[PDB]
Amino acid sequence: HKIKGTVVLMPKNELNLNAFLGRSVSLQLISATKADAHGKGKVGKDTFLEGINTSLPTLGAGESAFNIHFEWDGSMGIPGAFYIKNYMQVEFFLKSLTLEAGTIRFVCNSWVYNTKLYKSVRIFFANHTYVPSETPAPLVEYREEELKSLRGNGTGERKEYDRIYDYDVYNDLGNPDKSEKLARPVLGGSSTFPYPRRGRTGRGPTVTDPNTEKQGEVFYVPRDENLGHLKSKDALEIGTKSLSQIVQPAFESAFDLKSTPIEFHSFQDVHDLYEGGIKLPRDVISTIIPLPVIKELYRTDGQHILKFPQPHVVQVSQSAWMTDEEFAREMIAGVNPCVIRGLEEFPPKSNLDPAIYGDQSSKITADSLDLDGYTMDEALGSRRLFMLDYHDIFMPYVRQINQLNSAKTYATRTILFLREDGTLKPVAIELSLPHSAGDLSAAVSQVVLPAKEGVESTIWLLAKAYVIVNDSCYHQLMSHWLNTHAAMEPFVIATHRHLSVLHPIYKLLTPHYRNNMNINALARQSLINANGIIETTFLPSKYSVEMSSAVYKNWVFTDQALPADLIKRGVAIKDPSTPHGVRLLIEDYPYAADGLEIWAAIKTWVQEYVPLYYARDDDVKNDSELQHWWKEAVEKGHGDLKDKPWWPKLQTLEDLVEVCLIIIWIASALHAAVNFGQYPYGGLIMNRPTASRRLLPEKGTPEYEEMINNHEKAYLRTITSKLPTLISLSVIEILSTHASDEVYLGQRDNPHWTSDSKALQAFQKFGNKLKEIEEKLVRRNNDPSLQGNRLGPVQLPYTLLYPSSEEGLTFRGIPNSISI
């Protein structure tokens, strides 16, 4: 006669219970096996919640269980979906429906707003997995209609309760109606400025510029992309807006009123920040102390002091960051371990036009270098010469950056030698400037070599700082923002638009998108906006985001695969006799060696899951959702690069495995490796400066005399000033923290995400393999033979690719997704 059901939900004041009974909430079951005269599954009667189930012992925090009984004869078939209407004023979060007598499970995890706000009734499917040709016939039209609903029609201002996924260009960063100084180029949709697309918000044009989107208080994301949290301390993504809008002005007032020194005077004034702290005006502590997320960043006496946490890089030695050993080691085991390249000729060459920038020949001479007794030909031939090459990347921007008040940079190149002991050593830095006919500046390019004593040691320490300003900027805008956050969002949007929640590839990929659209929208509002966090703390100021567009011109999807990246950079060679198919040229390269282990584990998982759903190549060709998904992801999401010959075609099993593997790698391990080291390495501003403010001084000036007499002040005058340091330390502290509700690689948010037992078994094997790999990585960190590259003189074991972590600022753990 009746099917016993249990509804689990969370009332809004968690992310009383009697209000959900009576006629507050109705469900209707939908048949998967019996259809009406139009081929659509039969729908049951409106059925209301009957009472509160207090008998389950199992429920997670903030959740409540409700009993319900559905009238359903065997003639109606087997339920495969349900409709739900909320007649209450306030939305609730629907977790699940379970039907008994064998069991039928529905994983929902979705906000359900009042019924009058929706243009069609909310629908949820059971947890079975189907490619389109395997959809039971009575569900085929419901499946397609739900995808049409998610796509919308490309027009209208998006509202909080909307679940509409679509694309737009980055035209929402400028604020020209406030000032012409805050106008910014549109990024995307032109040859001049190609860029990934972002989620459409639809607020409409500014009054002064029809091509720029007006400001708004809330930047929309489709509703279920905006993750609630049980603990407000876990809402880390809200910290950037509080930092830009509340905390930053408060810091500014303490400086404007001359209540704290304007500049750091000595390195000890920087160390003080995590020791005794900084003293600020009472009203400034009182502004900062009570805000969620922000209040966790500092310890305080409640009256005048803020104290930052001690960064990992200084926990054993406060001075080791200054060693040449640590500067080079951080290129293979630091915050940004993926830019170094092999160098197979000498001198290094440039592809830029000498008619624009002047002669681009390198002025580093082979004979000046100390290669531990090797000749240059011997170092080149044995594959011991490497570089960190920012010359061609930065040179096109140097003139415009250097015209800003308080910014001055060089376009840098660093030469590295792989010693016989297996560590890297820096051997030269070239500090380059553009030159043209009528230039007003007399500053010249120069080469600086290592030195441990005298004024030459200060010049070398400053040369390292100019390199790390280039590296910091490239890390933040390109390795981190462009290659993870921005590159991924088009694939999120395409997946929801074209793959049904039923689809096996939706189930494979979507855990890897958790919180990504949300943190991106908050970033467009407060991180990468005109006058936002990055522009006010990093070297390029108003040129920062457009630099990332220039770099995107040479972004290649298939070169994001780890083996292809290593081969392209000349840090590994193809070798089919090896287990990973590549031979590393730096044997103990911690990022790459650990990374290959994680890459192989993801590859085995994808290669076991795909054949569960696709028997042959033509099964991939003939999946219409998959074909529409991939066509749109390329031609619209990354559409400014649609003309490029390197995009996989998606007509084979091999191509489907490859595309999925690359997406999962980018979202999980690549993002973790470039994100969770930000405060551990960069929490000491001298180790990771964000900006440089002057060029090297001329002999015979007061600034030159200061390098001799007060080297720490010379350094501190060159790098990021105190006020932007306070703001930038605060933001990287937030971004380096794991929320306690994170879902890590090898985990899913629900154990019943599919009913397919073979898929569940494959996923278990994947999780066990990641535990086995963590044991191996622990043995590598405990191997004294690997100390030089894995720990360095900072004595900081490389744990950034350990799969697991507890909450907090832990320097380890791989989330599924780009979640912060």
Q: How far is the CB of 740 from Fe ion (least distance, A)?
A: 18
Alpha carbon separation from 581 to 383, 449, 644 (Å, rounded): 19, 37, 27
Identify which of residues 212 and 817 has a Cβ nearer to Fe ion in the complex. 817
Interacting stretch for Fe ion, rule CB under 5 A, among 245-253, 459-467, 605-613, 674-682? 674-682
Residue 144, judged by CB atoms within 10 A of its CB (0-12, 13-18, 19+), counts as middle
SS3 string of 655-671?
A: HHHHHHHHHHHHHHHHH
Tokens at 333, concatenated: 């085991």
Looking at the Cβ atoms of 147 and 486, the one nearer to Fe ion is 486
DSSP E strands in 580-719: the ranges are: 582-584
Residue 206 or 515 with smaller CB distance to Fe ion: 515
588/528 Cα distance (integer angstroms): 36
Minimum separation from the CB atom of position 229 to Fe ion (A): 17
- Residue numbers belonging to the annotated binding site: 480, 485, 671, 675, 820
Judged by CB, which is closer to Fe ion: 135, or 675?
675
In the list 476, 675, 678, 817, the residue contacting Fe ion (rule: CB under 5 A) is: 675
**DSSP class of 244:** I
Residue numbers 526-545 binding Fe ion by CB under 5 A:
none
What dihedral angle (degrees, nearest 10) is formed by the CA atoms of 614, 131, 486, 193? 90
Three-state SS for 783?
coil
Residue among 21 and 235 whose Cβ is closer to Fe ion: 235
Residue 14 is encoded by which pair of tokens? 């968690």
Annotated catalytic residue within 475, 512, 580, 671: 671
The region of 85-93, 113-121, 653-661, 668-676 touching Fe ion under the rule CB under 5 A is: 668-676
CB-CB contact of 88 with 12 (8 Å): no
Q: Which of 541, 675 has the CB closer to Fe ion? A: 675
Active-site residue flag, 175? no
Query: How near is the Cβ of 484 to Fe ion at its closest, in Å?
Result: 6
Min dist. Cβ of residue 612 to Fe ion (A): 32
Q: Nearer Cβ to Fe ion, position 127 or 675?
A: 675
Spatial contact of 570 and 585, defined as CB atoms under 8 Å apart: yes
Q: Are 638 and 784 in contact (CB under 8 A)?
A: no
Whether 580 is a known active-site residue: answer no
- Choose one: 224-232, 534-542, 669-677, 680-688; the region binding Fe ion (CB under 5 A): 669-677
DSSP class per residue in 351-383:
-S-HHHHS-------GGG---TT--HHHHHHTT
Residue 681 phi, psi dihedral angles, 5° rounding: -95, -40
Using the minimum distance from each CB to Fe ion, give the nearer residue, 42 or 738.
Answer: 738
Reported as half-sphere exposure (CB side, CA atoms, 13 A), residue 530 has a value of 21
User: Is residue 485 annotated as part of the catalytic site, yes or no?
Assistant: yes
Residues 62-121 that bind Fe ion (CB under 5 A): none
The residue range among 216-224, 248-256, 564-572, 670-678 that interacts with Fe ion, by the rule CB under 5 A, is 670-678
Question: Helix, strand, or coil here: 447?
Answer: strand
Judged by CB, which is closer to Fe ion: 31, or 675? Answer: 675
Strand-strand pairing, 411-418 and 424-432: antiparallel
- Choose, from 675, 687, 789, 816, the residue flagged as catalytic: 675
With left for phi above 0 and alpha for psi between -120 and 50, is residue 426 left, alpha or beta? Answer: beta
Closest by Cα among 387, 429, 384 to 411:
429
Residue span binding Fe ion (CB under 5 A) among the ranges 461-469, 554-562, 604-612, 675-683: 675-683
H-assigned helices in 413-552 = 454-474, 487-498, 504-509, 516-526, 533-537, 544-552
CA 747 to chain centre: 19
Rounded least distance, CB 485 to Fe ion, Å: 6
As given in the structure block, the two tokens for residue 56 are 């389950």
Q: How far is the CB of 807 from Fe ion (least distance, A)?
A: 17
Please state the closest distance from residue 709 (CB atom) to Fe ion, in A: 41
Of the listed pieces 157-165, 300-308, 334-342, 667-675, which binds Fe ion according to CB under 5 A?
667-675
Nearest by Cα to 98 from 77, 71, 79, 85: 79
Q: Which of 312, 391, 475, 480 is catalytic?
A: 480
Q: In whole angstroms, how far apart are CA 551 and each of 369, 394, 548, 556, 741?
A: 31, 10, 5, 11, 34
Enumerate the H helices of 63-127 as residue ranges.
none
Amino acid in the structure at residue 96? S
Residues at the binding site for Fe cation are: 480, 485, 671, 675, 820
300, 322 contact by CB (below 8 A): no
3-state SS assignment for residue 149: helix
Q: How far is the CB of 658 from Fe ion (least distance, A)?
A: 24
**Residue 339 one-letter amino acid:** V
Angle (nearest 5°) at CA 804 between 800 and 808: 75
Nearer to Fe ion, 96 or 737 (CB): 737
Examine the residue annotation and report whether 480 is marked as an active-site residue of this protein.
Answer: yes
Q: By C-beta, is 675 or 754 nearer to Fe ion? A: 675
We find the least distance from the C-beta atom of residue 666 to Fe ion, in angstroms, to be 12
Tokens of 335: 């915050």
Q: Which residue is nearest to Fe ion (CB)?
A: 675
- Helices (H), strands (E): how many in the chain? 27, 21
**Environment class of 89 (CB within 10 Å of its CB; exposed 0-12, middle 13-18, buried 19+):** exposed
Judged by beta carbon, residue 254 or residue 527, the one nearer Fe ion is: 527
Q: How far is the CB of 236 from Fe ion (least distance, A)?
A: 11
Q: How far apart are CA 583 and CA 683, in angstroms?
A: 34
Q: Which neighbouring-strand residues pair with 9?
A: 64, 94
The CB-of-186 to Fe ion minimum distance in angstroms stands at: 24
Q: How far is the CB of 737 from Fe ion (least distance, A)?
A: 11
Cα–Cα distance for residue pair 796/86, rounded to 1 Å: 53
> Do 21 and 9 form a contact (C-beta atoms < 8 A)?
no
Choosing from 312, 485, 496, 512, the catalytic residue is: 485
Size of the site for Fe ion (CB under 5 A): 1
Spatial CA neighbour of 460 closest among 707, 709, 792: 707
After which residues does the chain have a break in its backbone, defined as C to next N over 2.5 Å? Answer: 15, 101
Stretch that binds Fe ion, among 35-43, 509-517, 530-538, 671-679 (CB under 5 A): 671-679
Measured CA to CA, the distance from residue 791 to residue 794 in angstroms comes to 7
518 binds Fe ion (CB under 5 A): no
Query: Using CB under 5 A as the criterion, which residues of the chain lie in contact with Fe ion when the complex forms?
Result: 675
Residues annotated as part of the active site: 480, 485, 671, 675, 820
